[PDB]
Amino acid sequence: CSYTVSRPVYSELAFQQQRERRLPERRTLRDSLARSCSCSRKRAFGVVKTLLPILDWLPKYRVKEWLLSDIISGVSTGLVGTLQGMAYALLAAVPVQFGLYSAFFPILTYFVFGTSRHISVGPFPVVSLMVGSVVLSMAPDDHFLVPSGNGSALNSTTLDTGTRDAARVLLASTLTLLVGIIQLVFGGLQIGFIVRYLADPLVGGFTTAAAFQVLVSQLKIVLNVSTKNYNGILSIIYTLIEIFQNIGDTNIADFIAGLLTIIVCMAVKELNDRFKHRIPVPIPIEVIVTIIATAISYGANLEKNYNAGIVKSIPSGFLPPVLPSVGLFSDMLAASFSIAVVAYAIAVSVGKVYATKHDYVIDGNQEFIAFGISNVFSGFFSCFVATTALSRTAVQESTGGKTQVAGLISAVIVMVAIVALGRLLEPLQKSVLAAVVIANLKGMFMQVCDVPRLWKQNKTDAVIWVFTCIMSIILGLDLGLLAGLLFALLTVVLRVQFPSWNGLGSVPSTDIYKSITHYKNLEEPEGVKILRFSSPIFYGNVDGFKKCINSTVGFDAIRVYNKRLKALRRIQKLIKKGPKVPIHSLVLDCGAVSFLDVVGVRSLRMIVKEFQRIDVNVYFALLQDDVLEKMEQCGFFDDNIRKDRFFLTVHDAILHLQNQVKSRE
Amino acid sequence: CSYTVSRPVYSELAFQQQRERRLPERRTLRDSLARSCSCSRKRAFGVVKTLLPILDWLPKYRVKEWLLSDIISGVSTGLVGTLQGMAYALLAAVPVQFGLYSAFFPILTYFVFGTSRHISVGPFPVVSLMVGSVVLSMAPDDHFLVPSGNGSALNSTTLDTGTRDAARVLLASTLTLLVGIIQLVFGGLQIGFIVRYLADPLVGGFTTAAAFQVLVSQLKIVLNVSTKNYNGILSIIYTLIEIFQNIGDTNIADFIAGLLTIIVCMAVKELNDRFKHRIPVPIPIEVIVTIIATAISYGANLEKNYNAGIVKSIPSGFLPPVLPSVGLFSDMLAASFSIAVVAYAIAVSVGKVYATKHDYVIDGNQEFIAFGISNVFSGFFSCFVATTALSRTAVQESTGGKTQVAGLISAVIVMVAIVALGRLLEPLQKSVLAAVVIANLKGMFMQVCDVPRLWKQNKTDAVIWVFTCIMSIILGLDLGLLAGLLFALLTVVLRVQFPSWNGLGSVPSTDIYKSITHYKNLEEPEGVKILRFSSPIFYGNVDGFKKCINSTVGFDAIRVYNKRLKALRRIQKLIKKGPKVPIHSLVLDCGAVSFLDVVGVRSLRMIVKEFQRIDVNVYFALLQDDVLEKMEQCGFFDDNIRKDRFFLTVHDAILHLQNQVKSRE
């Protein structure tokens, strides 16, 4: 209605005197640690309830109706879990037997420590690729050749099919433990802000570029070509050229059968997603395409007749726990930090999506402990890093899921897939398992459709997407993530180093000040020039502030004072023989400043001192309380630069100048 | 006097309608690039005058007294410069003549391209230390041994004093050429903000660590001990331990002479600095101590009698230009970048100091181009990277210097030294030259006295000093600088990621809003809770903003709605059979925001939508125009979230809320 106020001009001291401050809280280091560490039994029950979330949803279960919905989702997710679990094992260069272990043991551990209800912990295509990247680098194929077979001229150094996998499993187990330990450090030290640096364009471009490396890696299994497992700079680029050079040594039985299930699985997935209003339960195309593949491959001897590529290496049994090979963490610490941060990023990403739909809150630090113990327990049973795939997550959710009981039932299907089931999957072609992974790449391949949308939005965030996408292609995949985090943080520094400074003016007959580069009918005070400077001054943008002040006043505070003394020497000699016109004051509207960075405040006092020699006052308008208290501690208020130079609002600074000129001509 | 206003409550649209905006300037790339490149001869003359500043100060000379001032400053600066060059030649592991070379040609090159008047370009202790470090890393001593001399049992692999100096000089010349190329690239691309990242505490800690390493190296040289030129991690600690282990294999005469000249030089420097009011011209302690050392060392055969360490390797002549061995840049690019940036930082610091002391202006890009051309010209004459030492610079300023003519005269001394002066310097002990370097370390060793001062000041900047000082000691010296810049950028990001949020309240009978954690007698509106959030929202501080909102409203917008929906299903079943109390609105005083990082504006819109479901309006107070224009493009103003939700000032929102409560109960 009517916005009218009437108060005196409290600049800095007319308001600080009659306003009593609040005494700050004392540190009291002796008692601070005592009050923090609680001794009551209620705190002991609270830390156990959070650490073990199973004690919350289990007592209040709904066995009446939940048991019917969990038994149907467990057998549905179990069949998809035992297939996607063994399919993702090829991305880690590990035998297909250890892929099923990643779908049974991590579920058992993510039952008494997990804080989610609609998350199916298991393998992941992008995560398994980063695991397989360090296996090929630290244990290539040309490192296990054995001379045996009485060759023609030289020693017969045939392939090492057999004991070669033993070094790959132990290497992947050491990586699994080191990833789990890092996740426990994040949960133990209660540091969760380290994963906030993974922005949406950063994680979006990373998963998009990772889909290309997954497509190239899986295409090698489909085409049945033998590459040289290149790694380093241009890893995906070099291996893509080698694939085109070895096209002649392909297998038509694998390409035709591999491309067939690609079109079938993609069509059924697209048909079921579009016509969702008529069929609520998604058709398990992953399961029906595998059962029919093993049946056809069992009739005709695809291994002998067509010389196809089958598994024929499933022993159908468990294995004793193997202690991790401690001592190889020096050459894997750099890559483990990249795998441990993407396993948690996707865990929270998929978790929060299915959290607002079921209306339940997911703890942040608890997921670090949940997946931390999961990866550690998985390392003792020859498993790789566990995560939650978005496709497998939607299986137990769309079919009907309430708690992790359905996930435990999903582990029973994998349980029988280790002892009894597995012999029937012997003649299954490797191209079939290498095709269900490519079908799930549609979600990440369609993520490129955001670049035209992000360009119309904030352009700096669109560059981060393209930067992370290209950098995670040239210099590997794990190194590209670290190059994306540094580039994303650098973009934040570049946005605060080059602020958006304006020529703030006054709206007639009011007190609201708007920029002069946006509005025309604005009147500036006679002589006074207002300047606003966002992105608080630090050591890097303190030089830009000088160029900012020199551009809004028209002159330079240094060159003007130098020309004054250059002409002053003519005055002291003429008696022996015989610019700064418009700028009267400078009101700095530093209202968007948060910190000081005393390294830069030393030049801030110099600005007030330089303009003081040329009779130009430098006033302040909207300095906050947390900043003014910081200027006093940094040695700014001397005998000449008093607090009266500062003001509370922007209009008080202009009103103080108009009253000073009227009272003093 | 009286601050009174009377205007309607223009929130967002009551002000944007009747206020016509200014049309932004069109891009017009063709005309923009056409208007940028000027064709008139005036712009050509201007850029020629700027690129070659020699054409400016030459026509306005003051020969009458400037001739005498420049000749005396030139002889003094030439003596000081040849002494500092023959001293710093040992820091670069190069023979002593190449120091004199590097003290002659850079001076000639910094005459037609430099834009300063009181800068004596030459060697530098830190730069020479870095050059020597990278030379020892890329060319150790055990890589040149030759088996010759018919030893006792094995081949006599004597030391290679001699032919290895050619390789060392070639490596130093390649390094200097690469540094010059990097500086010319930085100057041509007009990129000057890259050196603004070197804050005052960062460069202070770097200079402190460099002074410590220089002290260690000069103590190694004085004690005449033979180390193993360790490099890498903890190199200074390892070489100090090796020195302490080889104390017995020293020379008592050399150590005594070094300690004596150190004490004498320090005492004379202290006496001249303290009693400056009586003697304006500083006593050249370096010149007299070198003269007396050469006089004493020439009497007795210190090389034969006391087995002292002398130079005896001065050919007293020039050398033809040698083309640099291009191809060794991939293993020294980072070191060259570090050397170039530290040299430019020190040069700009000295220039700004001696320019604000003499009241003249110095350009940045022109100095960059000048030093780049100087290093390039030095690379073609077997010289190392040139800079401006603070001690040598103060000589020509205290003795009286006006233009670079004194610098050109300062090269005449080095000119006659290259040919004639230096044959008498044959029996001079190396410990004497290794002492003035330690004597000049007093300025950098006293820089540690700022840590107690910076701790009372901004503590985050005090940590950067200690972090840079320690990190530039453990992992070399060049790598410590890169670890310091990244640490400073991370500290800047942490200050904008964890803002200082408050509980802003209202002062009675006024319109100024202050924090509630600082003032006691403050009244908040009935139900309304004002919140201020500095450090504008980006992808990393969004969870921080969520936590801040949840802490300032007392509840969580998610848990409240979850409990409401959990209690709602009890209502729909009871008819078949038979928190958010105080918070009325949320005025976000986002006045300290500059950018919004649309990745974060999505979560902001999500927050606004979530609080709408619980009947809690989220209003804005001080959103700038540059932020609203960004939110409009980032898809924020839908059919429901209109612009009326925003306000211009903080009191307007409270007034609108009170009017709505009064008109609608």
Side-chain angles (χ1 to χ4, degrees), chain A residues 1-25 28-29 31-34 36-40 42 44-573 575-665, chain B residues 1-25 28-29 31-34 36-40 42 44-573 575-665:
Chain A
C1 60
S2 180
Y3 170 76
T4 167
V5 296
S6 299
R7 60 176 179 88
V9 187
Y10 303 148
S11 59
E12 183 63 26
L13 73 162
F15 182 77
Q16 199 72 13
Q17 290 178 359
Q18 71 282 358
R19 214 68 59 181
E20 51 276 359
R21 302 180 65 259
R22 296 178 60 91
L23 56 153
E25 58 279 354
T28 320
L29 225 293
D31 190 70
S32 63
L33 45 83
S36 300
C37 180
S38 300
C39 192
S40 60
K42 182 57 73 278
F45 182 80
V47 296
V48 176
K49 182 66 62 178
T50 304
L51 183 61
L52 285 76
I54 182 183
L55 302 180
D56 191 10
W57 56 269
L58 181 60
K60 60 170 185 294
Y61 206 77
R62 289 182 173 88
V63 199
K64 178 60 181 300
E65 65 276 358
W66 283 6
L67 187 141
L68 182 60
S69 60
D70 295 330
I71 187 60
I72 189 261
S73 299
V75 298
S76 180
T77 311
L79 294 180
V80 184
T82 187
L83 295 181
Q84 295 184 359
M86 66 187 301
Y88 295 156
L90 299 180
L91 291 176
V94 298
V96 91
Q97 172 193 4
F98 304 91
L100 289 82
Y101 294 152
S102 180
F104 175 77
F105 299 97
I107 295 188
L108 298 180
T109 314
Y110 196 73
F111 194 84
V112 296
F113 296 108
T115 178
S116 180
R117 297 181 178 90
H118 293 173
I119 284 184
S120 60
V121 52
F124 195 88
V126 180
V127 179
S128 300
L129 178 63
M130 304 180 64
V131 175
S133 180
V134 309
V135 175
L136 298 176
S137 64
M138 205 58 59
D141 193 12
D142 62 330
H143 194 275
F144 300 92
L145 77 170
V146 42
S148 293
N150 59 267
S152 60
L154 73 161
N155 299 270
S156 181
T157 61
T158 58
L159 192 58
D160 198 11
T161 300
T163 61
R164 158 181 166 267
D165 76 329
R168 299 180 177 272
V169 178
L170 270 63
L171 183 61
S173 63
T174 54
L175 179 67
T176 311
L177 178 68
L178 188 51
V179 168
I181 293 180
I182 296 180
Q183 295 180 357
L184 291 180
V185 173
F186 292 155
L189 298 182
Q190 207 69 18
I191 164 180
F193 58 91
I194 193 178
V195 305
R196 302 178 183 178
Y197 296 153
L198 282 73
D200 192 12
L202 214 167
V203 73
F206 178 81
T207 55
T208 298
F212 290 94
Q213 299 185 6
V214 171
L215 178 59
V216 175
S217 300
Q218 291 288 264
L219 186 60
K220 178 183 60 60
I221 306 179
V222 175
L223 299 181
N224 196 91
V225 299
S226 60
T227 60
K228 209 176 299 300
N229 54 89
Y230 290 148
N231 197 327
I233 306 300
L234 298 178
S235 60
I236 178 182
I237 303 300
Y238 288 161
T239 188
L240 184 60
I241 304 300
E242 188 176 4
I243 290 180
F244 293 154
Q245 296 180 0
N246 300 331
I247 295 297
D249 300 0
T250 185
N251 194 332
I252 57 180
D254 298 330
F255 173 76
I256 296 180
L259 186 59
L260 180 60
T261 170
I262 284 294
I263 305 179
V264 172
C265 184
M266 182 61 61
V268 177
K269 183 62 62 180
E270 182 68 22
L271 180 63
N272 180 268
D273 192 11
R274 180 173 63 258
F275 293 158
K276 188 62 63 180
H277 60 271
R278 62 178 182 91
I279 302 298
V281 43
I283 167 71
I285 176 62
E286 271 71 283
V287 183
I288 188 60
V289 80
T290 305
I291 301 180
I292 193 60
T294 60
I296 298 300
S297 181
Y298 185 81
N301 194 331
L302 267 52
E303 173 71 291
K304 180 180 60 60
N305 303 332
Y306 292 157
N307 196 20
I310 65 175
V311 173
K312 70 178 182 180
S313 180
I314 300 180
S316 68
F318 293 88
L319 81 171
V322 181
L323 287 315
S325 179
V326 55
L328 303 179
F329 298 153
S330 60
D331 45 321
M332 299 189 304
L333 195 273
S336 301
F337 181 81
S338 300
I339 304 180
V341 71
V342 296
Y344 181 82
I346 305 173
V348 180
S349 180
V350 181
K352 290 300 180 180
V353 170
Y354 295 91
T356 178
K357 192 263 180 180
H358 194 262
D359 305 351
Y360 69 102
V361 185
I362 298 182
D363 199 333
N365 299 120
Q366 183 63 25
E367 295 287 348
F368 267 137
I369 302 298
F371 285 95
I373 308 179
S374 300
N375 299 330
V376 171
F377 187 85
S378 302
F380 295 154
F381 292 91
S382 300
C383 309
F384 42 84
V385 183
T387 332
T388 158
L390 182 60
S391 61
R392 184 175 61 258
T393 298
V395 178
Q396 63 178 184
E397 186 270 348
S398 54
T399 56
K402 305 301 297 181
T403 57
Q404 297 292 151
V405 179
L408 181 59
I409 301 180
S410 179
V412 183
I413 304 300
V414 189
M415 175 59 180
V416 76
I418 300 179
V419 45
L421 182 60
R423 187 62 178 271
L424 191 142
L425 302 180
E426 186 269 349
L428 176 59
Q429 287 185 153
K430 300 181 61 180
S431 300
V432 181
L433 298 178
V436 298
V437 185
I438 307 180
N440 295 126
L441 304 184
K442 180 61 64 61
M444 297 187 299
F445 275 150
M446 291 295 101
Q447 295 183 2
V448 197
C449 300
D450 76 330
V451 186
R453 182 59 59 90
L454 291 180
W455 190 264
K456 300 180 60 180
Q457 299 178 358
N458 180 270
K459 300 181 181 300
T460 63
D461 300 326
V463 181
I464 298 180
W465 196 100
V466 184
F467 191 92
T468 308
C469 179
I470 297 181
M471 220 56 55
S472 51
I473 288 180
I474 299 179
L475 42 145
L477 186 61
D478 55 75
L479 232 299
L481 177 67
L482 182 60
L485 294 175
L486 297 180
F487 183 83
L489 295 178
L490 181 60
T491 312
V492 184
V493 182
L494 293 181
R495 289 196 298 261
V496 304
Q497 188 180 4
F498 302 94
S500 60
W501 58 275
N502 298 327
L504 269 281
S506 180
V507 181
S509 180
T510 47
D511 63 330
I512 173 63
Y513 291 86
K514 310 302 295 180
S515 175
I516 196 60
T517 60
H518 294 354
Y519 302 91
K520 180 181 300 300
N521 296 20
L522 297 183
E523 51 177 10
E524 58 180 0
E526 207 290 80
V528 194
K529 186 60 179 300
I530 309 179
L531 175 62
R532 184 178 182 89
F533 187 85
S534 302
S535 300
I537 318 168
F538 59 99
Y539 62 87
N541 69 332
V542 64
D543 300 330
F545 199 16
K546 296 295 299 180
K547 185 180 300 300
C548 173
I549 297 181
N550 296 9
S551 300
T552 182
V553 307
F555 64 94
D556 195 335
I558 292 298
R559 296 192 299 266
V560 168
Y561 183 81
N562 293 9
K563 295 302 180 180
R564 287 298 181 179
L565 298 184
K566 185 180 300 300
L568 184 60
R569 48 94 180 185
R570 291 294 300 180
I571 302 300
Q572 62 181 0
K573 65 180 300 180
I575 55 180
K576 181 180 60 60
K577 178 181 179 60
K580 49 175 180 175
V581 181
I583 298 300
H584 181 210
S585 299
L586 178 64
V587 179
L588 295 182
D589 192 6
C590 300
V593 290
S594 64
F595 56 90
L596 261 195
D597 193 1
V598 59
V599 195
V601 93
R602 298 179 180 179
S603 179
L604 219 172
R605 184 179 60 90
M606 183 60 60
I607 295 177
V608 186
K609 191 64 178 181
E610 286 176 359
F611 283 92
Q612 184 67 21
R613 302 181 302 181
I614 61 180
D615 194 6
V616 175
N617 301 20
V618 179
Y619 294 156
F620 301 87
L622 290 175
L623 264 297
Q624 298 80 4
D625 302 358
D626 198 14
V627 187
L628 291 175
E629 296 291 339
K630 199 65 174 180
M631 306 188 73
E632 181 180 0
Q633 300 180 1
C634 295
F636 183 85
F637 302 93
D638 57 77
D639 197 14
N640 180 268
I641 305 180
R642 300 179 300 270
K643 292 183 177 300
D644 210 340
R645 193 168 302 273
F646 295 82
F647 296 86
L648 282 184
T649 63
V650 186
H651 197 195
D652 290 0
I654 302 301
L655 233 298
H656 183 56
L657 283 168
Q658 297 182 180
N659 298 329
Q660 181 180 0
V661 180
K662 182 180 180 300
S663 180
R664 195 272 301 270
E665 300 292 338
Chain B
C1 61
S2 180
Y3 170 77
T4 168
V5 297
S6 298
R7 61 175 180 89
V9 185
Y10 301 147
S11 59
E12 181 60 30
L13 73 163
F15 179 76
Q16 199 72 13
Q17 289 177 358
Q18 71 282 359
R19 218 67 59 181
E20 51 276 359
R21 302 180 65 259
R22 296 178 60 92
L23 56 153
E25 56 279 354
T28 323
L29 222 295
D31 183 70
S32 72
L33 63 89
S36 300
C37 180
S38 300
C39 192
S40 60
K42 180 57 73 278
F45 181 80
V47 301
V48 165
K49 183 71 63 177
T50 303
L51 183 60
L52 284 76
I54 180 184
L55 302 179
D56 190 10
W57 57 269
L58 182 60
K60 56 168 177 291
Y61 211 78
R62 291 183 175 89
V63 187
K64 180 60 180 300
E65 70 287 345
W66 280 15
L67 203 158
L68 180 60
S69 68
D70 289 327
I71 190 71
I72 188 264
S73 298
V75 294
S76 186
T77 312
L79 294 180
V80 175
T82 185
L83 292 180
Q84 290 187 6
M86 69 184 303
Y88 296 155
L90 301 181
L91 285 175
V94 297
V96 80
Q97 56 165 152
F98 299 92
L100 277 68
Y101 293 154
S102 180
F104 174 74
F105 297 97
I107 297 186
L108 300 184
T109 317
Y110 192 73
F111 191 84
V112 294
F113 296 108
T115 179
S116 180
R117 298 181 178 90
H118 296 170
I119 284 183
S120 60
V121 52
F124 195 87
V126 179
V127 183
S128 300
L129 172 69
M130 298 183 66
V131 172
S133 179
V134 303
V135 163
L136 293 178
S137 68
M138 206 56 61
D141 193 13
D142 63 330
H143 195 275
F144 294 89
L145 80 172
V146 42
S148 293
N150 59 267
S152 60
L154 74 161
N155 299 270
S156 181
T157 61
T158 60
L159 191 57
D160 198 11
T161 299
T163 61
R164 80 167 191 264
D165 82 324
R168 295 179 179 270
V169 168
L170 262 58
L171 185 59
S173 62
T174 54
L175 175 75
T176 310
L177 180 75
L178 189 52
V179 168
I181 290 180
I182 293 180
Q183 292 185 359
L184 289 182
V185 167
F186 284 165
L189 296 181
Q190 208 69 18
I191 166 180
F193 56 91
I194 188 179
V195 307
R196 300 179 181 179
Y197 295 153
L198 282 75
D200 191 11
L202 206 160
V203 69
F206 179 79
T207 49
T208 300
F212 269 93
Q213 295 183 1
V214 161
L215 177 60
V216 172
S217 300
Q218 299 295 266
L219 182 60
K220 174 186 60 60
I221 295 182
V222 164
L223 292 178
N224 198 91
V225 298
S226 60
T227 59
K228 209 177 299 300
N229 54 89
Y230 290 147
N231 197 323
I233 307 300
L234 294 177
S235 60
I236 171 180
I237 303 300
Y238 289 161
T239 188
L240 184 60
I241 293 300
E242 189 173 8
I243 289 174
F244 285 157
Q245 289 180 0
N246 300 330
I247 295 295
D249 300 0
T250 188
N251 194 330
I252 51 180
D254 295 331
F255 170 75
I256 287 180
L259 181 60
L260 180 60
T261 180
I262 280 292
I263 294 180
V264 168
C265 185
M266 185 60 59
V268 172
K269 183 63 62 180
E270 182 68 22
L271 182 63
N272 182 267
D273 192 11
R274 181 174 64 259
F275 293 159
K276 184 62 64 180
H277 60 271
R278 62 178 183 92
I279 302 298
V281 43
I283 167 70
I285 170 65
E286 274 63 278
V287 181
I288 180 61
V289 78
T290 304
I291 289 180
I292 191 60
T294 54
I296 295 300
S297 181
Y298 184 80
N301 195 331
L302 267 51
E303 174 69 288
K304 181 180 60 60
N305 304 332
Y306 293 157
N307 195 20
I310 64 176
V311 178
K312 70 178 182 180
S313 180
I314 304 182
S316 68
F318 291 86
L319 80 171
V322 180
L323 289 315
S325 180
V326 57
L328 305 179
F329 299 155
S330 60
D331 46 327
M332 297 190 305
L333 203 280
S336 300
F337 168 78
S338 300
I339 292 180
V341 67
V342 300
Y344 182 75
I346 297 171
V348 168
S349 180
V350 175
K352 290 301 180 180
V353 168
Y354 289 86
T356 191
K357 201 268 178 180
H358 198 264
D359 301 359
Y360 64 95
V361 188
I362 294 183
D363 199 333
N365 299 121
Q366 182 59 30
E367 286 289 343
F368 225 152
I369 291 295
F371 275 96
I373 297 180
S374 300
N375 297 331
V376 167
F377 188 86
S378 307
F380 295 155
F381 287 88
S382 300
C383 307
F384 43 83
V385 183
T387 332
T388 158
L390 182 60
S391 60
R392 183 179 62 258
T393 298
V395 177
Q396 62 178 184
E397 185 271 346
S398 55
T399 55
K402 305 300 297 180
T403 55
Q404 293 292 151
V405 179
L408 179 60
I409 299 177
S410 177
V412 183
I413 301 300
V414 192
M415 176 61 180
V416 79
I418 295 180
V419 46
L421 180 60
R423 182 60 182 271
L424 190 141
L425 305 178
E426 185 268 349
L428 176 57
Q429 286 185 152
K430 300 179 61 180
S431 300
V432 181
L433 301 179
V436 295
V437 191
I438 304 180
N440 293 129
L441 297 180
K442 178 59 65 62
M444 290 183 294
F445 279 154
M446 292 295 101
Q447 296 183 2
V448 196
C449 300
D450 76 331
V451 184
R453 182 58 59 91
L454 292 180
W455 191 264
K456 300 180 60 180
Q457 299 178 357
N458 180 269
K459 301 180 181 300
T460 63
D461 300 328
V463 181
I464 301 180
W465 196 100
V466 184
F467 192 93
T468 306
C469 179
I470 296 181
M471 218 56 55
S472 48
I473 287 181
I474 298 180
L475 42 144
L477 184 61
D478 55 75
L479 236 300
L481 176 80
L482 182 60
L485 296 174
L486 295 180
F487 180 80
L489 297 182
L490 181 60
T491 308
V492 171
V493 172
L494 287 180
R495 290 197 297 263
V496 305
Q497 187 181 4
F498 301 93
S500 60
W501 56 274
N502 299 327
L504 268 281
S506 180
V507 181
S509 180
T510 47
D511 63 330
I512 173 63
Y513 292 86
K514 313 300 294 180
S515 176
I516 196 60
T517 60
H518 293 354
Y519 302 91
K520 180 180 300 300
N521 296 20
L522 298 182
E523 54 177 8
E524 57 180 0
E526 207 290 80
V528 190
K529 183 60 179 300
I530 309 179
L531 182 67
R532 185 177 182 88
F533 190 87
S534 303
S535 300
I537 316 169
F538 60 100
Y539 63 91
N541 66 333
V542 43
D543 301 330
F545 195 21
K546 267 290 299 180
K547 182 180 300 300
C548 167
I549 294 180
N550 297 11
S551 300
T552 193
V553 307
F555 58 90
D556 196 334
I558 294 297
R559 295 194 299 265
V560 169
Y561 188 72
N562 292 9
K563 295 302 180 180
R564 285 297 181 179
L565 287 195
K566 184 180 300 300
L568 183 60
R569 50 93 180 183
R570 291 295 301 180
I571 302 300
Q572 63 180 0
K573 64 179 300 180
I575 56 180
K576 182 180 60 60
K577 177 182 179 60
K580 49 178 179 175
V581 181
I583 299 300
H584 182 210
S585 299
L586 179 62
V587 180
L588 296 182
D589 192 6
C590 300
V593 292
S594 59
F595 57 93
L596 263 196
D597 187 9
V598 53
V599 194
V601 93
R602 297 178 181 179
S603 181
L604 214 170
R605 181 180 60 90
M606 180 60 60
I607 293 172
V608 174
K609 189 63 179 181
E610 288 174 359
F611 275 89
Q612 184 67 22
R613 302 182 303 180
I614 59 180
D615 195 5
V616 176
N617 302 21
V618 177
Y619 295 156
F620 301 88
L622 291 172
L623 266 297
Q624 299 80 5
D625 299 357
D626 196 15
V627 189
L628 294 174
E629 293 291 339
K630 206 65 174 180
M631 299 181 72
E632 182 180 0
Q633 300 180 359
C634 293
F636 183 85
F637 301 94
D638 57 77
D639 195 13
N640 181 268
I641 305 180
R642 301 179 300 270
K643 292 183 177 300
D644 210 340
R645 193 168 302 273
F646 292 78
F647 295 84
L648 279 185
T649 65
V650 187
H651 195 196
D652 286 0
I654 304 300
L655 232 300
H656 180 58
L657 277 170
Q658 291 182 180
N659 296 328
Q660 182 180 1
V661 170
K662 181 180 180 300
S663 180
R664 198 273 300 270
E665 301 292 338

